[PDB]
Symmetry: D2
Subunit: 124 residues, 4 copies
Protein backbone atom coordinates (compact mmCIF):
# COMPACT_ATOMS: atom_id res chain seq x y z
CA UNK A 1 0.00 0.00 0.00
CA UNK A 2 0.95 3.67 -0.01
CA UNK A 3 3.28 5.11 2.62
CA UNK A 4 2.21 8.31 4.36
CA UNK A 5 4.81 10.41 2.50
CA UNK A 6 3.36 9.48 -0.89
CA UNK A 7 0.03 11.01 0.17
CA UNK A 8 1.21 14.58 0.61
CA UNK A 9 0.28 16.79 -2.33
CA UNK A 10 2.87 18.92 -4.11
CA UNK A 11 2.04 21.15 -7.09
CA UNK A 12 4.53 19.38 -9.39
CA UNK A 13 3.08 15.96 -8.58
CA UNK A 14 -0.55 17.10 -8.66
CA UNK A 15 -2.77 14.57 -10.43
CA UNK A 16 -6.44 14.62 -11.43
CA UNK A 17 -8.69 16.70 -9.17
CA UNK A 18 -5.63 17.78 -7.17
CA UNK A 19 -4.24 19.86 -10.07
CA UNK A 20 -7.16 22.31 -9.94
CA UNK A 21 -6.72 22.72 -6.16
CA UNK A 22 -2.93 23.33 -6.03
CA UNK A 23 -2.82 27.13 -6.19
CA UNK A 24 -5.22 27.65 -3.30
CA UNK A 25 -3.86 24.97 -0.93
CA UNK A 26 -0.07 25.10 -1.46
CA UNK A 27 1.57 27.21 1.25
CA UNK A 28 3.39 30.35 0.08
CA UNK A 29 6.67 30.91 1.91
CA UNK A 30 8.18 34.38 2.11
CA UNK A 31 11.66 34.12 3.60
CA UNK A 32 15.09 35.69 2.95
CA UNK A 33 17.46 33.76 0.62
CA UNK A 34 20.32 34.29 3.08
CA UNK A 35 20.53 34.80 6.83
CA UNK A 36 23.28 34.95 9.47
CA UNK A 37 23.68 32.05 11.91
CA UNK A 38 21.92 32.52 15.24
CA UNK A 39 20.26 35.78 14.15
CA UNK A 40 16.46 36.03 14.24
CA UNK A 41 14.58 36.72 11.01
CA UNK A 42 10.97 36.49 9.92
CA UNK A 43 9.27 33.91 7.72
CA UNK A 44 5.72 34.49 6.51
CA UNK A 45 3.58 31.54 5.45
CA UNK A 46 0.13 32.02 3.93
CA UNK A 47 -2.39 29.79 2.18
CA UNK A 48 -5.22 30.68 -0.18
CA UNK A 49 -7.47 32.43 -1.12
CA UNK A 50 -9.50 29.67 0.51
CA UNK A 51 -12.79 29.40 2.40
CA UNK A 52 -12.64 29.65 6.20
CA UNK A 53 -15.71 27.93 7.74
CA UNK A 54 -16.36 25.15 10.25
CA UNK A 55 -17.10 22.78 7.37
CA UNK A 56 -14.06 23.78 5.34
CA UNK A 57 -10.86 25.60 6.30
CA UNK A 58 -7.07 25.40 6.43
CA UNK A 59 -6.89 23.84 9.94
CA UNK A 60 -3.16 24.18 10.59
CA UNK A 61 0.36 24.72 9.27
CA UNK A 62 3.54 22.94 10.39
CA UNK A 63 7.06 24.14 9.57
CA UNK A 64 10.02 21.77 9.33
CA UNK A 65 13.67 22.31 8.41
CA UNK A 66 16.03 19.87 6.72
CA UNK A 67 19.33 20.88 8.29
CA UNK A 68 22.47 20.14 6.30
CA UNK A 69 24.83 17.63 7.86
CA UNK A 70 22.38 16.48 10.58
CA UNK A 71 22.54 12.72 11.23
CA UNK A 72 18.72 12.66 11.12
CA UNK A 73 16.15 15.03 9.65
CA UNK A 74 14.04 17.00 9.63
CA UNK A 75 13.78 19.29 12.63
CA UNK A 76 10.32 20.55 13.40
CA UNK A 77 10.32 24.32 13.82
CA UNK A 78 6.76 25.21 14.74
CA UNK A 79 3.09 24.47 14.37
CA UNK A 80 0.15 26.86 14.23
CA UNK A 81 -3.53 25.90 14.42
CA UNK A 82 -6.36 28.21 13.35
CA UNK A 83 -9.93 28.23 14.63
CA UNK A 84 -12.41 28.11 11.69
CA UNK A 85 -14.07 31.48 10.99
CA UNK A 86 -11.79 33.57 13.22
CA UNK A 87 -8.17 33.09 12.17
CA UNK A 88 -6.97 33.28 8.57
CA UNK A 89 -4.16 30.96 7.43
CA UNK A 90 -1.52 33.69 7.15
CA UNK A 91 1.13 33.72 9.86
CA UNK A 92 4.55 35.24 10.56
CA UNK A 93 7.18 33.24 12.49
CA UNK A 94 10.52 34.42 13.87
CA UNK A 95 13.26 31.79 13.48
CA UNK A 96 16.95 31.35 14.27
CA UNK A 97 18.91 29.01 12.04
CA UNK A 98 22.37 27.56 12.65
CA UNK A 99 23.27 25.90 9.34
CA UNK A 100 21.98 25.98 5.75
CA UNK A 101 19.11 23.75 4.73
CA UNK A 102 15.59 23.50 3.42
CA UNK A 103 12.47 25.01 4.96
CA UNK A 104 9.23 22.97 4.55
CA UNK A 105 5.70 24.25 5.19
CA UNK A 106 2.82 21.74 5.35
CA UNK A 107 -0.78 22.91 5.51
CA UNK A 108 -3.88 20.79 6.14
CA UNK A 109 -7.34 21.36 4.70
CA UNK A 110 -9.99 19.15 6.29
CA UNK A 111 -11.51 18.39 2.86
CA UNK A 112 -8.49 18.54 0.59
CA UNK A 113 -5.58 16.96 2.45
CA UNK A 114 -1.95 17.84 3.08
CA UNK A 115 0.01 20.22 0.87
CA UNK A 116 3.76 20.93 0.86
CA UNK A 117 5.94 23.87 -0.11
CA UNK A 118 9.66 24.15 0.40
CA UNK A 119 12.32 26.86 0.19
CA UNK A 120 16.10 26.72 0.40
CA UNK A 121 17.73 29.01 2.96
CA UNK A 122 21.44 29.70 3.10
CA UNK A 123 23.02 30.34 6.50
CA UNK A 124 26.38 32.13 6.63
Amino acid sequence: MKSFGELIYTPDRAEGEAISKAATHTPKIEAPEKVKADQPFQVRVSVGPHPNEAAHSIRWIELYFYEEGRPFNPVMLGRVAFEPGYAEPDVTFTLKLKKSGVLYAISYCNLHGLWEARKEIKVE
Copy 2:
Protein backbone atom coordinates in the same frame (compact mmCIF):
# COMPACT_ATOMS: atom_id res chain seq x y z
CA MET B 1 -6.82 23.07 46.41
CA LYS B 2 -6.93 25.85 43.83
CA SER B 3 -9.02 25.96 40.68
CA PHE B 4 -7.04 25.94 37.44
CA GLY B 5 -8.03 29.56 36.80
CA GLU B 6 -6.37 30.68 40.04
CA LEU B 7 -3.03 29.23 38.91
CA ILE B 8 -2.68 31.60 35.96
CA TYR B 9 -0.15 34.40 36.49
CA THR B 10 -1.29 37.94 35.79
CA PRO B 11 1.38 40.63 36.15
CA ASP B 12 -1.39 42.55 37.92
CA ARG B 13 -1.54 39.68 40.44
CA ALA B 14 2.17 38.88 40.89
CA GLU B 15 3.01 37.90 44.48
CA GLY B 16 6.23 36.23 45.67
CA GLU B 17 8.82 35.14 43.12
CA ALA B 18 6.21 35.68 40.38
CA ILE B 19 7.03 39.42 40.55
CA SER B 20 10.52 39.07 39.03
CA LYS B 21 9.49 36.72 36.20
CA ALA B 22 6.56 38.87 35.06
CA ALA B 23 8.45 41.09 32.57
CA THR B 24 10.03 38.19 30.67
CA HIS B 25 6.96 35.89 30.65
CA THR B 26 3.98 38.22 30.16
CA PRO B 27 2.87 38.32 26.50
CA LYS B 28 2.89 41.69 24.72
CA ILE B 29 -0.08 42.11 22.42
CA GLU B 30 0.10 44.55 19.53
CA ALA B 31 -3.30 45.04 17.96
CA PRO B 32 -5.43 47.93 16.75
CA GLU B 33 -7.96 49.53 19.10
CA LYS B 34 -10.74 49.44 16.50
CA VAL B 35 -11.36 47.18 13.52
CA LYS B 36 -14.17 46.67 11.02
CA ALA B 37 -16.36 43.56 11.29
CA ASP B 38 -15.17 40.62 9.18
CA GLN B 39 -12.14 42.59 8.02
CA PRO B 40 -8.78 40.80 8.47
CA PHE B 41 -6.26 42.56 10.69
CA GLN B 42 -2.99 41.48 12.24
CA VAL B 43 -2.12 40.78 15.86
CA ARG B 44 1.48 40.45 17.00
CA VAL B 45 2.19 38.54 20.20
CA SER B 46 5.67 38.40 21.71
CA VAL B 47 7.29 37.20 24.94
CA GLY B 48 10.79 38.00 26.14
CA PRO B 49 13.58 38.49 26.48
CA HIS B 50 13.58 34.82 27.46
CA PRO B 51 15.85 31.74 27.31
CA ASN B 52 15.23 29.44 24.32
CA GLU B 53 16.68 25.98 25.02
CA ALA B 54 15.40 22.42 25.43
CA ALA B 55 15.56 22.70 29.21
CA HIS B 56 13.89 26.14 29.29
CA SER B 57 11.75 28.01 26.75
CA ILE B 58 8.35 29.45 25.93
CA ARG B 59 6.75 26.27 24.58
CA TRP B 60 3.60 27.84 23.23
CA ILE B 61 1.15 30.72 23.05
CA GLU B 62 -2.65 30.42 22.90
CA LEU B 63 -5.03 33.18 21.75
CA TYR B 64 -8.59 33.40 23.14
CA PHE B 65 -11.41 35.89 22.61
CA TYR B 66 -14.24 36.91 24.92
CA GLU B 67 -17.00 37.81 22.48
CA GLU B 68 -19.64 40.23 23.77
CA GLY B 69 -23.17 38.83 23.83
CA ARG B 70 -21.96 35.27 23.28
CA PRO B 71 -23.92 32.85 25.56
CA PHE B 72 -20.71 30.97 26.30
CA ASN B 73 -17.10 32.13 26.38
CA PRO B 74 -14.33 32.28 25.51
CA VAL B 75 -13.64 31.43 21.88
CA MET B 76 -10.21 30.06 21.02
CA LEU B 77 -8.66 31.90 18.07
CA GLY B 78 -5.46 29.98 17.50
CA ARG B 79 -2.42 28.28 19.05
CA VAL B 80 1.26 28.25 18.13
CA ALA B 81 3.89 25.84 19.46
CA PHE B 82 7.59 26.66 19.20
CA GLU B 83 10.56 24.31 18.87
CA PRO B 84 13.15 25.10 21.57
CA GLY B 85 16.30 26.64 20.10
CA TYR B 86 14.77 27.32 16.67
CA ALA B 87 11.58 29.40 16.90
CA GLU B 88 11.37 32.58 18.97
CA PRO B 89 8.15 33.36 20.85
CA ASP B 90 7.11 36.23 18.56
CA VAL B 91 4.23 35.56 16.19
CA THR B 92 1.85 37.58 14.02
CA PHE B 93 -1.67 36.23 13.47
CA THR B 94 -4.28 37.46 11.02
CA LEU B 95 -7.73 37.55 12.66
CA LYS B 96 -11.34 38.32 11.79
CA LEU B 97 -13.84 39.53 14.38
CA LYS B 98 -17.56 40.25 14.18
CA LYS B 99 -18.26 41.59 17.69
CA SER B 100 -16.33 43.67 20.22
CA GLY B 101 -14.57 41.96 23.11
CA VAL B 102 -11.37 41.12 24.94
CA LEU B 103 -8.35 39.44 23.40
CA TYR B 104 -6.45 37.06 25.72
CA ALA B 105 -2.91 35.75 25.18
CA ILE B 106 -1.60 32.84 27.27
CA SER B 107 2.06 31.84 27.09
CA TYR B 108 3.53 28.72 28.69
CA CYS B 109 7.08 28.37 30.01
CA ASN B 110 7.95 24.79 31.06
CA LEU B 111 9.55 26.08 34.27
CA HIS B 112 7.61 29.21 35.08
CA GLY B 113 3.95 28.53 34.31
CA LEU B 114 1.07 30.17 32.51
CA TRP B 115 1.03 33.93 31.89
CA GLU B 116 -2.01 35.94 30.83
CA ALA B 117 -2.17 39.26 29.00
CA ARG B 118 -5.31 40.91 27.67
CA LYS B 119 -6.48 43.65 25.32
CA GLU B 120 -9.89 45.07 24.46
CA ILE B 121 -10.85 45.30 20.78
CA LYS B 122 -13.76 47.32 19.39
CA VAL B 123 -15.57 46.16 16.26
CA GLU B 124 -17.38 48.69 14.06
Copy 3:
Protein backbone atom coordinates in the same frame (compact mmCIF):
# COMPACT_ATOMS: atom_id res chain seq x y z
CA MET C 1 -12.82 43.46 33.96
CA LYS C 2 -12.79 39.66 33.54
CA SER C 3 -9.52 37.74 33.71
CA PHE C 4 -9.06 34.55 31.70
CA GLY C 5 -9.10 32.12 34.63
CA GLU C 6 -12.48 33.50 35.66
CA LEU C 7 -13.96 32.42 32.32
CA ILE C 8 -13.21 28.72 32.86
CA TYR C 9 -16.27 26.69 33.88
CA THR C 10 -16.17 24.51 36.97
CA PRO C 11 -19.05 22.30 38.07
CA ASP C 12 -18.03 23.85 41.38
CA ARG C 13 -18.99 27.35 40.30
CA ALA C 14 -21.35 26.65 37.41
CA GLU C 15 -24.33 28.99 37.35
CA GLY C 16 -26.95 29.78 34.72
CA GLU C 17 -26.92 27.82 31.46
CA ALA C 18 -23.46 26.62 32.52
CA ILE C 19 -25.18 24.44 35.15
CA SER C 20 -27.18 22.38 32.61
CA LYS C 21 -24.27 22.07 30.14
CA ALA C 22 -21.95 20.91 32.93
CA ALA C 23 -22.66 17.16 32.82
CA THR C 24 -21.88 16.85 29.10
CA HIS C 25 -18.78 19.10 29.06
CA THR C 26 -16.99 18.47 32.36
CA PRO C 27 -14.07 16.01 32.00
CA LYS C 28 -14.24 12.73 33.91
CA ILE C 29 -10.85 11.59 35.25
CA GLU C 30 -10.07 8.01 36.19
CA ALA C 31 -6.72 7.78 37.96
CA PRO C 32 -5.35 5.90 40.95
CA GLU C 33 -5.47 7.63 44.33
CA LYS C 34 -1.88 6.62 45.06
CA VAL C 35 1.09 5.84 42.81
CA LYS C 36 4.78 5.10 43.33
CA ALA C 37 7.15 7.88 42.27
CA ASP C 38 8.52 7.56 38.72
CA GLN C 39 6.24 4.56 38.15
CA PRO C 40 4.09 4.80 34.99
CA PHE C 41 0.34 4.52 35.44
CA GLN C 42 -2.67 5.38 33.34
CA VAL C 43 -5.08 8.27 33.47
CA ARG C 44 -8.27 8.06 31.46
CA VAL C 45 -10.01 11.30 30.57
CA SER C 46 -13.42 11.30 28.87
CA VAL C 47 -16.11 13.88 28.04
CA GLY C 48 -19.73 13.28 27.11
CA PRO C 49 -22.14 12.27 25.94
CA HIS C 50 -21.53 15.11 23.51
CA PRO C 51 -22.10 15.89 19.82
CA ASN C 52 -19.20 15.17 17.48
CA GLU C 53 -19.59 17.16 14.24
CA ALA C 54 -17.64 19.91 12.41
CA ALA C 55 -20.03 22.54 13.73
CA HIS C 56 -19.93 21.26 17.33
CA SER C 57 -17.49 18.92 19.11
CA ILE C 58 -14.97 18.62 21.93
CA ARG C 59 -11.91 19.93 20.06
CA TRP C 60 -9.22 19.08 22.57
CA ILE C 61 -8.25 18.15 26.11
CA GLU C 62 -5.24 19.54 28.02
CA LEU C 63 -3.77 17.86 31.13
CA TYR C 64 -2.03 19.96 33.77
CA PHE C 65 -0.43 19.03 37.07
CA TYR C 66 -0.01 21.13 40.18
CA GLU C 67 3.16 19.78 41.77
CA GLU C 68 3.48 20.17 45.54
CA GLY C 69 6.50 22.27 46.44
CA ARG C 70 7.24 23.49 42.91
CA PRO C 71 8.11 27.22 43.03
CA PHE C 72 5.96 27.72 39.94
CA ASN C 73 2.82 25.92 38.79
CA PRO C 74 1.32 24.19 36.99
CA VAL C 75 3.12 21.78 34.68
CA MET C 76 1.37 20.77 31.48
CA LEU C 77 1.47 16.99 31.07
CA GLY C 78 0.01 16.60 27.60
CA ARG C 79 -2.52 17.77 25.03
CA VAL C 80 -4.72 15.81 22.66
CA ALA C 81 -6.63 17.28 19.70
CA PHE C 82 -9.58 15.42 18.20
CA GLU C 83 -10.88 15.55 14.62
CA PRO C 84 -14.65 16.24 14.49
CA GLY C 85 -16.70 13.16 13.55
CA TYR C 86 -13.78 10.71 13.71
CA ALA C 87 -12.28 10.78 17.21
CA GLU C 88 -14.29 10.63 20.42
CA PRO C 89 -13.19 12.74 23.41
CA ASP C 90 -12.05 9.66 25.37
CA VAL C 91 -8.33 9.16 25.87
CA THR C 92 -5.91 7.28 28.12
CA PHE C 93 -2.53 8.80 28.97
CA THR C 94 0.43 7.12 30.59
CA LEU C 95 2.07 9.39 33.15
CA LYS C 96 4.80 9.17 35.74
CA LEU C 97 5.06 11.57 38.66
CA LYS C 98 7.75 12.32 41.23
CA LYS C 99 5.71 14.28 43.78
CA SER C 100 2.12 14.40 45.04
CA GLY C 101 -0.22 17.06 43.68
CA VAL C 102 -3.37 17.92 41.76
CA LEU C 103 -4.26 16.72 38.28
CA TYR C 104 -6.20 19.16 36.06
CA ALA C 105 -8.19 18.29 32.94
CA ILE C 106 -9.42 21.06 30.62
CA SER C 107 -11.75 20.31 27.69
CA TYR C 108 -12.70 22.81 24.97
CA CYS C 109 -16.02 22.79 23.16
CA ASN C 110 -16.18 25.27 20.28
CA LEU C 111 -19.67 26.49 21.28
CA HIS C 112 -19.58 26.01 25.05
CA GLY C 113 -16.07 27.01 26.15
CA LEU C 114 -13.58 25.62 28.65
CA TRP C 115 -14.40 23.07 31.34
CA GLU C 116 -12.23 22.04 34.27
CA ALA C 117 -12.10 18.99 36.50
CA ARG C 118 -9.49 18.07 39.08
CA LYS C 119 -8.23 15.07 41.02
CA GLU C 120 -5.73 14.86 43.86
CA ILE C 121 -2.95 12.31 43.37
CA LYS C 122 -0.70 11.05 46.16
CA VAL C 123 2.84 9.91 45.35
CA GLU C 124 4.87 7.71 47.71
Copy 4:
Protein backbone atom coordinates in the same frame (compact mmCIF):
# COMPACT_ATOMS: atom_id res chain seq x y z
CA MET D 1 15.92 18.55 -3.75
CA LYS D 2 14.14 16.23 -1.30
CA SER D 3 10.36 16.40 -0.83
CA PHE D 4 9.09 16.31 2.75
CA GLY D 5 7.43 12.92 2.25
CA GLU D 6 10.76 11.35 1.35
CA LEU D 7 12.21 12.31 4.73
CA ILE D 8 9.86 10.26 6.88
CA TYR D 9 11.50 7.10 8.22
CA THR D 10 9.87 3.70 7.74
CA PRO D 11 11.53 0.44 8.84
CA ASP D 12 11.53 -1.11 5.34
CA ARG D 13 13.22 1.97 3.85
CA ALA D 14 15.75 2.56 6.66
CA GLU D 15 19.17 3.51 5.26
CA GLY D 16 22.40 3.25 7.24
CA GLU D 17 22.45 4.69 10.76
CA ALA D 18 18.64 4.82 10.86
CA ILE D 19 18.28 1.01 10.64
CA SER D 20 19.43 0.66 14.26
CA LYS D 21 16.98 3.34 15.53
CA ALA D 22 13.90 1.78 13.90
CA ALA D 23 12.68 -0.63 16.60
CA THR D 24 12.58 2.09 19.25
CA HIS D 25 11.10 4.92 17.14
CA THR D 26 8.52 3.20 14.88
CA PRO D 27 5.04 3.51 16.44
CA LYS D 28 3.28 0.28 17.43
CA ILE D 29 -0.41 0.27 16.52
CA GLU D 30 -2.77 -2.09 18.35
CA ALA D 31 -6.16 -1.94 16.62
CA PRO D 32 -8.91 -4.41 15.61
CA GLU D 33 -8.68 -5.86 12.06
CA LYS D 34 -12.40 -5.29 11.59
CA VAL D 35 -14.89 -2.78 13.01
CA LYS D 36 -18.52 -1.79 12.31
CA ALA D 37 -19.25 1.57 10.68
CA ASP D 38 -19.93 4.39 13.16
CA GLN D 39 -19.24 2.18 16.18
CA PRO D 40 -16.57 3.42 18.61
CA PHE D 41 -13.51 1.22 19.23
CA GLN D 42 -10.08 1.74 20.78
CA VAL D 43 -6.69 2.06 19.11
CA ARG D 44 -3.57 2.03 21.27
CA VAL D 45 -0.41 3.64 19.90
CA SER D 46 2.95 3.32 21.70
CA VAL D 47 6.59 4.04 20.92
CA GLY D 48 9.81 2.74 22.49
CA PRO D 49 11.35 1.83 24.86
CA HIS D 50 12.91 5.28 24.45
CA PRO D 51 14.34 7.96 26.74
CA ASN D 52 11.96 10.66 28.06
CA GLU D 53 14.08 13.73 28.93
CA ALA D 54 13.93 17.43 27.94
CA ALA D 55 16.95 16.85 25.67
CA HIS D 56 15.53 13.74 24.02
CA SER D 57 11.99 12.37 23.86
CA ILE D 58 9.10 11.34 21.64
CA ARG D 59 7.45 14.80 21.48
CA TRP D 60 4.19 13.87 19.76
CA ILE D 61 2.16 11.39 17.75
CA GLU D 62 -0.29 12.17 14.93
CA LEU D 63 -2.85 9.74 13.51
CA TYR D 64 -4.21 9.92 9.96
CA PHE D 65 -6.58 7.71 8.00
CA TYR D 66 -6.52 6.97 4.28
CA GLU D 67 -10.23 6.55 3.67
CA GLU D 68 -11.24 4.36 0.69
CA GLY D 69 -12.98 6.22 -2.14
CA ARG D 70 -12.43 9.71 -0.70
CA PRO D 71 -11.62 12.25 -3.41
CA PHE D 72 -8.67 13.51 -1.34
CA ASN D 73 -6.72 11.88 1.49
CA PRO D 74 -5.81 11.45 4.17
CA VAL D 75 -8.04 12.55 7.01
CA MET D 76 -6.32 13.59 10.19
CA LEU D 77 -7.85 11.75 13.16
CA GLY D 78 -6.01 13.28 16.08
CA ARG D 79 -2.77 14.47 17.59
CA VAL D 80 -1.25 14.03 21.04
CA ALA D 81 1.69 15.97 22.46
CA PHE D 82 3.71 14.71 25.46
CA GLU D 83 5.53 16.84 28.01
CA PRO D 84 9.05 15.43 28.38
CA GLY D 85 9.71 13.64 31.68
CA TYR D 86 6.02 13.39 32.59
CA ALA D 87 4.06 11.66 29.84
CA GLU D 88 5.22 8.41 28.23
CA PRO D 89 4.53 7.92 24.50
CA ASP D 90 1.79 5.34 24.98
CA VAL D 91 -1.74 6.49 24.29
CA THR D 92 -5.20 5.01 23.65
CA PHE D 93 -7.65 6.83 21.35
CA THR D 94 -11.32 6.07 20.69
CA LEU D 95 -12.35 6.33 17.02
CA LYS D 96 -15.40 5.92 14.78
CA LEU D 97 -14.70 4.92 11.19
CA LYS D 98 -17.20 5.06 8.32
CA LYS D 99 -15.42 3.20 5.53
CA SER D 100 -12.43 0.85 5.19
CA GLY D 101 -8.93 2.27 4.83
CA VAL D 102 -5.43 2.57 6.21
CA LEU D 103 -4.56 3.96 9.63
CA TYR D 104 -1.22 5.86 9.89
CA ALA D 105 0.72 6.81 13.04
CA ILE D 106 3.63 9.27 12.82
CA SER D 107 5.76 9.91 15.88
CA TYR D 108 8.43 12.59 16.26
CA CYS D 109 11.66 12.35 18.22
CA ASN D 110 13.46 15.73 18.58
CA LEU D 111 16.80 14.06 17.70
CA HIS D 112 15.79 11.24 15.40
CA GLY D 113 13.07 12.60 13.15
CA LEU D 114 9.68 11.36 11.95
CA TRP D 115 8.71 7.69 11.94
CA GLU D 116 5.73 6.01 10.31
CA ALA D 117 3.66 2.91 11.00
CA ARG D 118 0.53 1.85 9.20
CA LYS D 119 -2.31 -0.62 9.70
CA GLU D 120 -5.18 -1.64 7.46
CA ILE D 121 -8.66 -1.61 9.02
CA LYS D 122 -11.80 -3.10 7.50
CA VAL D 123 -15.09 -1.34 8.15
CA GLU D 124 -18.30 -3.31 7.64
